[PDB]
Amino acid sequence: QDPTQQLEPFLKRFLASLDLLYTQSQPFPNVESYATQLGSNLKRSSAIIVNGQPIIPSPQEDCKLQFQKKWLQTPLSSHQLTSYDGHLIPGTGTFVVHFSAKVRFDQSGRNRLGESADLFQENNQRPIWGSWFGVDVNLVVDENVMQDGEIINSMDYRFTYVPND
């Protein structure tokens, strides 16, 4: 558009932050440096809803931190942006951005730090992607999108389709 052009690179950067591959010799992984990069364009007190369930801020942990600690516990993700649209709403300094994506998840049994909880079971490591989930996402983001700091005021993230697996 005029003002929507910069939205696509921003969306791809945001999604790539959710799909971050952990990199590293040291005995225990750097959990906090990894997890604070997840969805890092979120603002500390952004409104966040995942599948209809809001993240509730506690005095100890703001919404962004809570989200990052929950997202950390998902298997490695891979999102593909499939559509977006956006409206600059006058007198707000914000875009509403409505986008869709497909997302799939690592089925290998390893978590995002490369570790598997298989000690009791009877058992290079590349991710083994499962089937595509559908996702619908709505963001309210600051008009000055060219910055990749904390610009997202709210995110509503909603699975539209979950494959049998």
Add this chain to the structure above:
Amino acid sequence: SRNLATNFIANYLKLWDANRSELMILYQNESQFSMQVDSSHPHLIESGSTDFGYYLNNSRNLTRVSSIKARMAKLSIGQEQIYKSFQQLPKTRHDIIATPELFSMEVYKFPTLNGIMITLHGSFDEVAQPEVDGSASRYHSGPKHKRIPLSKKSFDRTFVVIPGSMIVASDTLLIRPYTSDFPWKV
């Protein structure tokens, strides 16, 4: 707020299926509407792929439209433009009264202007061709083409509603393949 949104959506969809001209009071000069098609969206398979023929020319899927002219031509601003977009969408029935369980919804605060965000997810039946054929005859307006099939679609729709009684500031409709399986089912 959760009840004020349930009522908004209930009345909206009644008129969206019946008389779309009756919705135009909700929109003002600065109000915005656009519709986007996501033909790649996941869905339960089991006639072939979905035919999006009525939707494609007006689709503002901004990953697929690169020229500034086309990007701005698919955005509707103000009552007149928005009403014309509404006339080019197939006529529908959303079965929200009988089967409200086909639908999911989030409602929360917009950061400014004392507004609320309402997002609805679900499906609809197409019951008739659009009033105005925006797909590119005596049976339809515009240039001749072979008959486009009507079919169910799934969708998501986001409203920013403000005090202004109620004014829709922003309205985005996403159209995608019908999925008879979805995570809020049963």
